[PDB]
Amino acid sequence: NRLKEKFNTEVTENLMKKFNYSSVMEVPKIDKIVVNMGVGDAVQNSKVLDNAVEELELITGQKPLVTKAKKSIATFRLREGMPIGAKVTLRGERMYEFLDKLISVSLPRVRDFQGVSKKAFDGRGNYTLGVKEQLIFPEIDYDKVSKVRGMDIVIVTTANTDEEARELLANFGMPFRK
Amino acid sequence: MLLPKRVKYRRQHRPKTTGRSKGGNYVTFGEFGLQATTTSWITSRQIESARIAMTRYMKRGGKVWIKIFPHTPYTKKPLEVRMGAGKGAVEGWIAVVKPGRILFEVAGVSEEVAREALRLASHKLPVKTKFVKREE
Amino acid sequence: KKGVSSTKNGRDSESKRLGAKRADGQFVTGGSILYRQRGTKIYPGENVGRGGDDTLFAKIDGVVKFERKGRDKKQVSVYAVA
Amino acid sequence: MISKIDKNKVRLKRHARVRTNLSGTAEKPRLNVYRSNKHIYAQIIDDNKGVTLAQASSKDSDIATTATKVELATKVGEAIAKKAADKGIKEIVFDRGGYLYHGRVKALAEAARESGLEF
Amino acid sequence: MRVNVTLACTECGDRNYITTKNKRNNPERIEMKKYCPRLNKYTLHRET
RNA sequence: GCGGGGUGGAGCAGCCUGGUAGCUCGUCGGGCUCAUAACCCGAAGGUCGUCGGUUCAAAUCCGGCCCCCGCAACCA
RNA sequence: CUGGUGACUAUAGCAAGGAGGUCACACCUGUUCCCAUGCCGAACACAGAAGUUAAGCUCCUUAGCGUCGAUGGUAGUCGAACUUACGUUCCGCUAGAGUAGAACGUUGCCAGG
RNA sequence: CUGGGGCGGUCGCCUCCUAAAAGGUAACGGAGGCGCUCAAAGGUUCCCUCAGAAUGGUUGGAAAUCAUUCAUAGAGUGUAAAGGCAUAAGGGAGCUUGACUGCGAGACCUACAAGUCGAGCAGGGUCGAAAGACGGACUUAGUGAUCCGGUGGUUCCGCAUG
RNA sequence: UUAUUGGAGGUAGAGCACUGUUUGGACGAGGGGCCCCGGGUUACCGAAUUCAGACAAACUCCGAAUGCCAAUUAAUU
Ligand SMILES: [Mg+2]
Ligand SMILES: [Mg+2]
Ligand SMILES: [Mg+2]
Ligand SMILES: [Mg+2]
Ligand SMILES: [Mg+2]
Ligand SMILES: [Mg+2]
Ligand SMILES: [Mg+2]
């Protein structure tokens, strides 16, 4: 619980001092992490989705939930109810472990890493990170992976504003592009 | 030629013409306007003729507001046909005008110029008219 | 005599005699149809059943009362006479 | 920013839907169960007259004791049934209150059945 | 559903019910539990 | 009044049965020939008459509009 | 006063500002067990109580919005007389819109304070 | 049938407007659908809430899947339209076959023949802890008399009697 | 038949809350003709939004007069 321990002690102290929170409950926290992989290629080949599912299962350590198309789009050759993606929701200990690994190992492994974007906030204190390849994650092996694929990592924070969210992520040690 | 871009129904019941004007009985965009004192259908052609006449006299120095729009389509049977076998094809587009309705509004000119311009417009229209000003 | 075209209309279904079958304040025996309707313009009330076609019927002998059921809804109920 | 739902409001919506087909007559009064994080409350209600015939709760001193919430629930269910017996109530319709029929809510219901209230 | 089906009680062979099925959707003879009047009990009834 | 058709530059398929633009000629680049034609090789080119509608999706289905074609236009 | 559970067409709502926490209600703490996730103890379920009024919630103020809403007048209209006038007149009924105003709920039962 | 007849069009059924605020109401009046479909798209129990928009994010583009907020229904409801449905009639899952048998007080509609709704009773069941719900489908089209013949069942008849 | 009372229903009128139709104002989400990954500004502003003003047999936030159905209802017939 290294990341959790920091949050409980060091991060909480920094945030409450910074924003003059009246109560400890006010202090922002990361509610959940959702990893989404969109696989439109799955329409062309079912195997592509299967390979993605395995990769996400390895990365997160939990079985992904296959996502089915809400609607049919002719341009994408998409039919409603077709499996075109996979998602995992990480909560509790699993979330902290994944996040610490991302900052500690996976983000460093990113090729030509120049820090993460500071502008990637929804305006409601929620941050989304896009990874170019899943090779960055330590578990994934280059030989095993037939096709390099990107992923969306959404970090949902209880923080009302981006600035409070930015502080929380900075305290966690998330690199920022500045 | 003013006409609706589309309508849900091309063949419609002809409008009720008895009664007095529901709305647009006051000058709201201009200094002066033309008020209808009689009831009649006003065609798109009639509106254009009246519009062209008033703009010419005004010399385009003033601004013209056309209050009435010909929403309702009306049909006519092909020539030399007997009765029945369906309603005819759309022939024109008309606005129902009842007494009190302000047909046009004019601004950016002296009253004298406006009175003449509206007079020229009035002679192009089926209804009888009276020159009117904004009231306070 | 000019030749003539034809209309593509000329069709209508039989009217279904929908609406109220019994008055408010009238005694009805059980099973009496109170209202005929598509959907529920009037909801089934007290001692009133709704049929598969949404017909409202008395489930007991009593007096018919049409009542408000919220701001924009109405119901019909039957109450047994003393 | 992620909103946290109010659990009571959600269950109340669920209760209203249950209430459409469920009502308490004098002959068959409704047994309403309200469950909080710490306590469970039971009321026998006649909906036609809009009156509560009997009540029993964990917060009540007699029922209050050191026990698991399910254990307490059984005690509340036994208590309400005995009180209902005093008022001559044997037939009741169980109102789950919009809560799932499991655990604490079930234990209260089962206890009342065992005591003699007929569901 | 494209075809009319007759369901016969397996035990007594009585053609108690008639129904419809889609032959393409349900190529096999359909079977279902139905009340049999002669038996006065629910029994498996199979399409003839 | 009622049918049919409008698809690379030309002629002609695909529509019935929505997802797929074909064939022959022409055009274009190369070759053969002293040169041309013929012949040989490679290649490009049609928003499917036009506006709308329906549909995830329209050459295809449905409705107007324009153009063209066929048939009918009778009894006094 | 608080809570549970009912009645009523939002005058009851929404929004904004403020206040409140032995109990109660939450948030919350865990997942051993009952039970649960088309992945996730998020939820559901259960076992709890370290912390917290932050939020929900409850209360107070308000009339910005939503809601309610006259009187008077008008449109329309039953009947009648007169007429053929895109009509008139008389009588009864009488809107919609808008205006003044109302309104930040009113209450039944049961258990606690 | 027909604003003479022919020719053209049409013929049953469903929905709307014409229809004059009950119902009903015509023209070769104005608009559209039907001659099905579904083994769940039926029953029940439990659970759930949309479309759209803004912003952030990779393959990813206006638009795929993800996240937050706003969003009262502009979504969905097999299939026309209308009336309904967000206490769902819409969506998901588990279990099922009530898409039961005998019926039926009363009522609607109605020239007749038909057509429609129906509480409740009995038998035997499904789902539910239970109350209870279920005699198809959100409702209203998807259909054709009699005669005759085929097939299955039958404590019915059997031309002196079997 | 009338009086009194209760009810069903959506027409006239009206209105624009919905579905369409429509006039004149402003106004812009976002880049192109335009002036710098280093900013601007004389179309389109089509999205959208807003203020004012109109239209509808198959529009309705509304909504009569009448007519209709009833009442252990009274008067007259
Ligand atoms: Mg009809
Ligand atoms: Mg040559
Ligand atoms: Mg009517
Ligand atoms: Mg009428
Ligand atoms: Mg015969
Ligand atoms: Mg014999
Ligand atoms: Mg009108």
* Domain containing residue B40: 24-136
* CATH code of the domain covering residue D28: 3.30.420.100
Does the CB of A147 have a partner CB in chain D at under 8 Å?
Answer: no
Ligand number, closest to the Cα atom of B16: 7
Q: In this structure, how many other beta carbons lie within 10 angstroms of the beta carbon of residue B45?
A: 15
* Domain assignment present for B76: yes
SS3 B56: helix
Experimental method for this entry?
cryo-EM
CA atoms within 13 A on the CB side of C3: 1
Determine, yes or no, domain membership for A175: no
Number of CB atoms found within 10 A of residue B76's CB: 11
Domain membership flag for residue D59? yes
Tell me if A98 sits within 8 A of A2, measured CB to CB.
no
Structure tokens at B54: 């008033």
- Check if C11 contacts B (Cβ < 8 Å): no
d(CA A71, CA A78) in angstroms, rounded, equals: 8
A176 found inside a domain: no
The owner of tokens 């026998």 is D44
> What's the structural domain count of chain A?
1
Contact check, Cβ <8 Å, C6/B86: yes
How many helices (H) and strands (E) chain D has is answered by 3, 4
Q: Which chain A residue lies closest to D3 (C-alpha atoms)?
A: A158
Q: Is residue A72 part of a domain?
A: yes
- Domain annotation covers residue D65: yes
Q: Taking CB atoms and an 8 Å cutoff, what residues of chain A touch D2? A: 31-32, 126, 156, 158
D104-115 and D69-86 helices, crossing angle to 10°: 30
Judged by CB atoms closer than 8 Å, whether chains meet at B78 and C6 is answered as no
Q: How many domains, chain B?
A: 1
Domain membership flag for residue A178: no
**Closest nucleotide to D105's CA, by C1' atom?**
H129
Which nucleotides of strand I lie under 7 Å from a protein CB?
5-9, 12-15, 20-24, 52-59, 62, 69-72
Query: Looking at the CA of B15, which ligand is closest?
Result: 7
Phi and psi at residue D105, to the nearest 5°: -60, -45
Q: Is residue A70 part of a domain?
A: yes
Q: Which residues sit opposite E4 in a β-bridge?
A: E20
Cα(B12)–Cα(A41) distance, integer angstroms: 53
Residue B136 belongs to domain with CATH number: 3.90.1170.10
Using a 10 angstrom Cβ sphere, with 0-12 exposed, 13-18 middle and 19 or more buried, the burial of residue A146 is exposed
What is the enclosing helix (H) or strand (E) of D42?
A: strand D40-46
CB D45 within 8 A of CB D28: no
**How many Å apart are CA D42 and CA D109, to the nearest integer?**
10
Query: CATH number of the domain that A104 lies in?
Result: 3.30.1440.10
Sole residue written with tokens 């068959």? D28
What does the DSSP assignment read for A70-115? SS-BTTTTB-TT-EEEEEEEE-THHHHHHHHHIIIIIHHHSTT---
Which residues from C are below 8 Å from B82, CB to CB?
1-2, 4
A72: CB within 7 A of chain F nucleic strand: yes
Report if residue B47 sits inside a domain. yes
Residue A63 lies in a domain: yes
Total domains, chain D: 1
Q: D103: left (phi > 0), else alpha (psi -120 to 50), else beta?
A: left
* CB contact burial E5-30 (16+ within 10 A = b; e otherwise): bebbbeeeebebeeeebeeeeeeeee
* Contact present, E37 and E16 (Cβ < 8 Å): yes
Specify which residues E44 forms β-bridges with. E33
Q: Provide the resolution (angstroms).
A: 2.2
Domain carrying residue D44: 21-110
CA of A98 to C1' of F41 (A): 63
- What are B40's two structure tokens? 């009649």
- Coil, strand or helix at A135: helix
> Does some domain include residue B119?
yes
Alpha-carbon distance values, C13 to A143, C6, C17, C39 (Å): 71, 20, 12, 19
Cα distance between residue E22 and residue A123, in whole Å: 54
CB-based burial of residue C12 (10 Å sphere; 0-12 exposed, 13-18 middle, 19+ buried)?
exposed
CA atoms of B91 and A79, how far apart (whole Å): 46
Contacts 24+ apart (CB under 8 A), D109-114: D109/D31, D109/D33, D109/D77, D110/D74, D110/D77, D111/D73, D111/D74, D111/D75, D111/D76, D111/D77, D111/D78, D111/D81, D112/D31, D112/D42, D112/D77, D112/D78, D112/D80, D112/D81, D112/D84, D114/D77, D114/D78, D114/D81
DSSP assigned state of A116: B
CA A81 – CA A123 distance, rounded (Å)? 32
Residue whose structure tokens are 């009319």: E4
Determine, yes or no, domain membership for D115: no
Angstrom distance (rounded) from CA A147 to CA A125: 33
Phi, psi for D67 (deg, rounded to 5): -155, 165
List the domain range (segments joined by +) for residue A63: 4-168
Task: Specify which residue's alpha carbon is closest to the C1' of nucleotide H118.
Answer: C31
